[PDB]
Structure 1
Amino acid sequence: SGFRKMAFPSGKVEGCMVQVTCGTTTLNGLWLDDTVYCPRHVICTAEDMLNPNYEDLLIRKSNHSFLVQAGNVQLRVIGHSMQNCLLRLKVDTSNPKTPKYKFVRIQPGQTFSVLACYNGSPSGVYQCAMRPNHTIKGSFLNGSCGSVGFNIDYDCVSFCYMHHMELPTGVHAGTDLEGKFYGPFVDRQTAQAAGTDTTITLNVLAWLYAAVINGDRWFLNRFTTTLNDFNLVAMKYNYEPLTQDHVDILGPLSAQTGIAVLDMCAALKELLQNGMNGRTILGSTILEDEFTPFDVVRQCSG
């Protein structure tokens, strides 16, 4: 019952947040075992951000060029390397609080928790989704960089995102724990259109099923709609095209609630076209798409 944009317990991720400083640049880092990840752009001098040559800027650095700090104790960096847009600083001590973890490049539309950090210190956690344009509509300020995006599968933390940029659109862009950006962005402060955004159709349906699982039903109709017709409409409303895989995914949620995916699609279509009569769905006044089908099934069943 009830429905919140729920984030995973950030506890296990906090125990891996550290401060990493190079020159006068300081940002967050992930310290797992004997390694610390952070946006390689930490080595970027001010003026060096217009068009930095990381390979060049890094070679001019050394282990001691990095001031990695765990809380208030200085971590000794005894090895460093670059992996795409990351810095993999090896340290001498191994973080005893390193949770069971895995690095995963999430798929646009998927959701994850973000531990907003500043100076290697957890400031807040929020759940967000990998927007369709690969950016993340988040709340980040200067110094949030190095914050990690993660998921928790029981006790195994899946790091999927590491903050890096701030597209002018006000959104945010980062990398996966392997340094590869999400979207067509780069470690440069150079014009970067935060690509055409779309509404995650998959999630809005998952969300609508959630509202239904929770008793709300007013938006349903006797109408139905082919996958193709739903798309012809949805796309007009700037919605991600809905694929058969998506409806397969909504399968479970379809069963429970007993509503056929396209029927729900028929409801979504109506909503899009008739607006919400001012009325609300599961609280919101606008179709929510930051809850994946998996999220919903996890927050409604048990």
Structure 2
Amino acid sequence: LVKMSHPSGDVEACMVQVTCGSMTLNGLWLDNTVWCPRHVMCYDALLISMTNHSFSVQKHINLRVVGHAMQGTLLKLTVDVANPSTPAYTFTTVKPGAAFSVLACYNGRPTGTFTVVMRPNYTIKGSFLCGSAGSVGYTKEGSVINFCYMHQMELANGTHTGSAFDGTMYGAFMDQLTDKYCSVNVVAWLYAAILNGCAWFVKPNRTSVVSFNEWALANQFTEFVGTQSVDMLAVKTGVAIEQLLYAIQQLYTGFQGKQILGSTMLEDEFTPEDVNMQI
């Protein structure tokens, strides 16, 4: 079990530096659009201020701005060349629990890639430094890249958030509720354990989904919704979901010893789809 990101090449070819007056950060060049975070101008008063000569766009790794809009927390620039390296793409929101890949960029230059999970408090625990705004998070299905996160800000140490390409910011933060354990990913990780001969924590005892979801409201766990991915894990291991929901209720109380895939606490950052693909 490894934190595994999509290869970053397709996205790499779309990362541009967008600049406006003093501030500069990362932009996403798709077709004739350049997406970027709007605080590049620091709002409706600020938009009237600018002209197309207020934005310069550079590709590092020759563009003129001939259009300007704002859409939510995002600037929708238009440019005179369609990116010849534009992947087949989509805009979509990620619901909490789900994982996506991040291309961390600075001054329009990609420098790192890693995977994060969209936390239940609508933040993400990645590694972002000053000027990484405009880095893009994405997943990939078949051949269609699917862009789901533009980076914008850092709330406290290590907690970051950002927007979907519809301009909406995750968790409505303007340019934090308590975190919870993603119950369905914990379930996946527990199945991953069983599939690697580490099954000391399984009992015949069971907790119904409804009982667990009530218990979850009281202990900062997410509502469990079963999926085909989880069901396939159930079949292969022989161990029912509800057994795992019981073991969670007990393991949270403490590991009393005793390890699971090298960890002393619960892991909620690997998804069912993650586990299936890797095991």
The code of the aligned residue for 1:276 comes to F
Taking the aligned partners of 2:203 and 2:130, their CA distance within structure 1 comes to 47
Residue in structure 2 matched with residue 267 of structure 1 by the alignment? 247
Shift of 1:90: 0.9
Residue 297 (structure 1) aligned to one of 243, 259, 276: 276
Residues 171-222 of structure 1, C-alpha deviations (whole Å, 9 max, x = no match):
01100011101102112xxxxxx22211111111111112222332122122
Q: Please state if 1:216 is matched with 2:198.
A: yes
Alignment size in residue pairs: 279
Residue 62 (structure 1) aligned to one of 48, 51, 59: 51
Taking the aligned partners of 1:228 and 1:265, their CA distance within structure 2 comes to 10
Residues 223-281 of structure 1, C-alpha deviations (whole Å, 9 max, x = no match):
21122333344444321132xx33665222211212111111112222112x2234322
Q: Please state if 1:200 is matched with 2:188.
A: no
**Deviating 4+ runs (over 3 angstroms):** 231-237
Identity %: 52
Distance 1:278 1:70, change over 3 A: farther
Q: Please state if 1:288 is matched with 2:270.
A: no
Q: Please state if 1:101 is matched with 2:89.
A: yes
TM-score by length of 1: 0.87
The code of the aligned residue for 2:112 comes to G
Shift of 1:92: 1.2
3-state SS of the aligned residue for 1:210? helix
Whether the aligned pair in 2 keeps the contact of 1:237 and 1:272 (CA below 8 Å) is no
Residue 39 (structure 2) aligned to one of 24, 27, 41: 41
Give the stretch that moved more between structures: 258-267 or 277-286: 277-286
Whether the aligned pair in 1 keeps the contact of 2:252 and 2:265 (CA below 8 Å) is no
Residue 177 (structure 1) aligned to one of 144, 165, 168: 165
Residue 226 (structure 1) aligned to one of 208, 212, 216: 208
Taking the aligned partners of 1:222 and 1:176, their CA distance within structure 2 comes to 43
Taking the aligned partners of 1:93 and 1:178, their CA distance within structure 2 comes to 22
Taking the aligned partners of 1:180 and 1:283, their CA distance within structure 2 comes to 38
The code of the aligned residue for 2:134 comes to G
Shift of 1:152: 1.0
What pairs up with 1:1-302 in 2 under 5 angstroms?
3-44=1-42, 54-71=43-60, 74-168=62-156, 170-187=158-175, 194-242=176-224, 245-246=225-226, 250-273=230-253, 275-300=254-279
Whether the aligned pair in 2 keeps the contact of 1:10 and 1:115 (CA below 8 Å) is yes
3-state SS of the aligned residue for 2:160? coil
Taking the aligned partners of 2:30 and 2:223, their CA distance within structure 1 comes to 38
Taking the aligned partners of 2:40 and 2:147, their CA distance within structure 1 comes to 20
Give 5+ residue unaligned stretches, structure 2: none
Q: In angstroms, what is the RMSD of aligned CA positions? A: 1.7
Residue in structure 2 matched with residue 48 of structure 1 by the alignment? none
Taking the aligned partners of 1:184 and 1:170, their CA distance within structure 2 comes to 19
Taking the aligned partners of 2:37 and 2:49, their CA distance within structure 1 comes to 17
